[PDB]
Every structure is written in C-alpha cells, then in structure tokens.
Ligand binder design. Structure first.
Ligand SMILES: [Mg+2]
Length: 137
RNA sequence: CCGCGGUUCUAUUUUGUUGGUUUUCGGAACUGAGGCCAUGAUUAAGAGGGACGGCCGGGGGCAUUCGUAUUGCGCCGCUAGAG
C-alpha cells in the first residue's frame, strides 16, 4: 500500500511540476516523468475565495504546500520543475505566483531537480488581441 | 583643283553685185581615262549610353521547403474550478 512504489530509502523518485504561473492564476500541476499521469494539481483559485488574489504569492504558496503534502503522501521525494508563463502571442514573463510557489515547495520538504522554461514561444503567432491602438487605460 | 578624251545647238563676217558662205569658225550641251590634293573623320568630358569581369543586395515574379505558435478535434490522468 502507501500509494507508492517499492523504492529503497536512499533512492529518490522524480516527479515533474508544471507551474503555469500566469497573471490572475497560478497552476501547480505535478505529473509523472512521462506527463500522461498526474499526481496532484492545486491552484490558487481553489485555495482563495477573493477572486483577485488567484495569482497572488499567498495563494500560490498555499497551493505549493498542499501539493507538497500530496506528493509526500503518494511517495514522491524529488521533483523536476517546468515553469511556464502565459505564452503564445501574449506576455512571456511568469506572473507573481511563480516565485512564491517555488520557495514554498522547496521549504515544505521536497527536492528539486532541473528547472526549465517551457513558455510557448511562437516563431510568428497570429495577430494579438487588443487592436493597433492597444489597451487604452 | 588642274588639264586631256567623250556630245547637242547657238551671237556673229565682210569668200561687200545677189546666191552660196568653211562659218571646226568663238562658245555649250552629255562624258571616259588620269595627275595631284600631307587627299578628306578634333579630342575622347571626374557628360551620357552600351559592351566586358568579379562580386553585392529583407530588390521583383514563379515554384518549393521548414518553424513553433493560435484555434479546433480525437484518445489518456486527477481534480471544481477555469477565464
Ligand atoms: Mg494614460
């Protein structure tokens, strides 16, 4: 039982943590090495009820802590990391939830593998939304 | 330019007795073979055109090739949120 494999004590098991930390949301999604099988997915939206702090560091770190206890529960010690922003033709830098989810996951008893950016980078995308005069504010 | 060949008519004579005048009479008509001309073309625009040589360029047109992205769809996984 214990919802895990028969791995030895010294040997560590690697998951893959896709962090789609965009603006207005912070996806934390731990899958296996293939990516076709997920272990746990917690988001700042499901950790807060204010609807404006869904990309906030507080909600992102709550999601990171919650997914950490699930990974330890199911028997995962190490974790590769694939950070991802909105991508496409829209913004390319990750939102505010990427950093707090990163620190909270590490400080909640987890190991870190290799960190890579997997933001979708078009060669040349379709026309962006907003018009030629942009978002007048 | 300088002469020499080569063709049609015409001012005029007086070969004053008329008639006949040669009138080539003088010159002007078309032309063949020459000599000579120092024989005859200014230079080649830091003007232009063109040719020639090697390169150069998101120049143009046609065909071909690749890229991830966006959107949608088909199977798989866990979740109540996603935007
Ligand atoms: Mg303004």
């Amino acid at each position: 039982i214990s919802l895990g494999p028969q791995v030895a004590e010294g040997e560590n098991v690697f998951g893959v943590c896709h962090i789609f930390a965009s603006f207005n949301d912070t996806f934390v999604h731990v899958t296996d090495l293939s990516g076709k099988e997920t272990i746990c997915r917690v988001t700042g939206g499901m950790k807060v009820k204010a609807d404006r702090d869904e990309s906030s560091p507080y909600a992102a770190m709550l999601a990171a802590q919650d997914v950490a206890q699930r990974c330890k529960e199911l028997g995962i010690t190490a974790l590769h990391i694939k950070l991802r922003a909105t991508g496409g033709n829209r913004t390319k830098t990750p939102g505010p939830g990427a950093q707090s989810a990163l620190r909270a996951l590490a400080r909640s008893g987890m190991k870190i593998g290799r960190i890579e950016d997997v933001t979708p980078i078009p060669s040349d995308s379709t026309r962006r939304k907003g018009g030629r005069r942009g978002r007048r504010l």
